[PDB]
Amino acid sequence: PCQAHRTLDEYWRSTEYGEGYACDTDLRGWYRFVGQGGARMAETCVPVLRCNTAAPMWLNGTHPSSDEGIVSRKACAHWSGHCCLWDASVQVKACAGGYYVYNLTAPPECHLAYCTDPSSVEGT
Amino acid sequence: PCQAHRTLDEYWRSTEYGEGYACDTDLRGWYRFVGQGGARMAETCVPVLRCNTAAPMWLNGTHPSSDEGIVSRKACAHWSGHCCLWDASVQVKACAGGYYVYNLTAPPECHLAYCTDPSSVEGTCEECSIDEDCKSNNGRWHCQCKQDFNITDISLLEHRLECGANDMKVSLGKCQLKSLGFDKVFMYLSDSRCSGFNDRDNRDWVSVVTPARDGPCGTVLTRNETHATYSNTLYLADEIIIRDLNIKINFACSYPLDMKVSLKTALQPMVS
Amino acid sequence: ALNIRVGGTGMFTVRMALFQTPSYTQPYQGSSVTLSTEAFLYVGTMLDG
């Protein structure tokens, strides 16, 4: 979990990026988002065609606070104008420090990738 | 003969059994010895009081090889300390595969019976490849290849060269080389550390793998404006030294420089 | 000394990978990929020759 995870450093993943076609059909396991893209991922359905993706996703609901344990959330997929038109299963868990982990599972179809908002790198 | 015979699955005929009384006079016909007693009948006069009989018997001479036909032997009987004191008529015939058939007759009087040695049950013929006949010499099975494989000169030698992307390799079916007169070959590149080795894909082959690089085995790369060739030299001899008939295989295969790619995934645009 | 001359002709291996992402990390295992005109494409050609 908080010690068994794979670091992801990608500046293109941000919601600010124009568009691409990434679909993370191979991302297996727990991941710690880092870089200018952001440590936490997008909390709201970002407008379509962003994050180097035709249809990026977002975690619906809030990030768990500290000492929350295993938290089950369902990643929503904004596409064709219907936010959360497709759904995935994620398990976000709090970690010691200003970072989190996620159980990122393969989307049912391609052109579905995750984002990272700038989040709270300021919040120290 | 090889197809019209009876078997005897009896472990007591081996030359290790202690002692007994049973004697063979009802044995009539051709028999195939099978079991833990043995597959072949004895070659030397076993000491007395073995094989479940007071006076065990043996076959004098040797078991015939493959492809001989009908062979007549005079089975001897060891008794009273004098090997081959009584005699009987036997007819041994080899067969396709690892077994023999014997014309087993009744000895003149009781207290005479046949034995079986452990023989060559460890020795097998499946180790011979499909193009290797199940031949034998003096009772020992060997892999004689197709007799049709008979090439006199060396110009007609078969060379299986495929020029793989990473490396080139020259293969030689070992049947043609064994017919050529080299019981064992020595494939020596520009550097002898590149000695060849055996491999089997559809038949027996011995091959040299030379990496497609400049220098790794003294490989000489020569590239012109169009293609690039790797030129080296191979050396063959039946022994470590050479005294006549020098063999030099100067093979060289060349790769292209202008060459194409297309994507394997269809792409579809959509625009407002 | 008798010299035999033979040879061959071999082809190098060269491919493409439809890299889902910029900076060219992960190729594409599909057979039909559907994008909009505004999206960028991230490809290349690789050489195992």
Ligand SMILES: *[C@@H]1O[C@H](CO)[C@@H](O[C@@H]2O[C@H](CO)[C@@H](O[C@@H]3O[C@H](CO)[C@@H](O)[C@H](O[C@H]4O[C@H](CO)[C@@H](O)[C@H](O)[C@@H]4O)[C@@H]3O)[C@H](O)[C@H]2NC(C)=O)[C@H](O)[C@H]1NC(C)=O
């Ligand atoms: C630069 O170097 C390259 C590579 O060495 C060279 O290409 C070679 O061109 C020559 C000249 O034509 C070819 O020579 C061969 O010679 C004999 C007959 O003379 C045959 O082996 C070849 O003909 C065969 O062609 C086909 C091959 O399967 C078959 O139809 C059939 O087997 C024919 O017999 C051929 O004429 C030589 O093969 C090529 N090398 C290759 C193809 O790898 C090129 O010409 C050089 N350029 C220069 C010097 O400007």
Ligand SMILES: *[C@@H]1O[C@H](CO)[C@@H](O[C@@H]2O[C@H](CO)[C@@H](O)[C@H](O)[C@H]2NC(C)=O)[C@H](O)[C@H]1NC(C)=O
């Ligand atoms: C995230 O957490 C789940 C729950 O521990 C991990 O295991 C999955 O558990 C569910 C529920 O039993 C099974 O149906 C899945 O098959 C399990 N997945 C695997 C791969 O075994 C899950 O692996 C975690 N995901 C990531 C991406 O780390």
Ligand SMILES: *[C@@H]1O[C@H](CO)[C@@H](O[C@@H]2O[C@H](CO)[C@@H](O)[C@H](O)[C@H]2NC(C)=O)[C@H](O)[C@H]1NC(C)=O
């Ligand atoms: C073994 O082979 C012989 C010869 O093929 C078979 O026939 C014997 O042949 C001799 C020589 O002509 C005759 O004198 C014998 O009378 C024949 N024997 C018999 C039993 O008829 C012989 O039968 C074969 N033996 C066995 C045990 O199969």
Ligand SMILES: *[C@@H]1O[C@H](CO)[C@@H](O)[C@H](O)[C@H]1NC(C)=O
């Ligand atoms: C995800 O959360 C959002 C925001 O609260 C909500 O609109 C949506 O219905 C949720 N999805 C599911 C499957 O409950």
Ligand SMILES: *[C@@H]1O[C@H](CO)[C@@H](O)[C@H](O)[C@H]1NC(C)=O
């Ligand atoms: C049987 O073979 C042995 C071994 O060579 C030989 O000494 C003996 O004389 C042979 N028997 C006859 C009858 O010739």
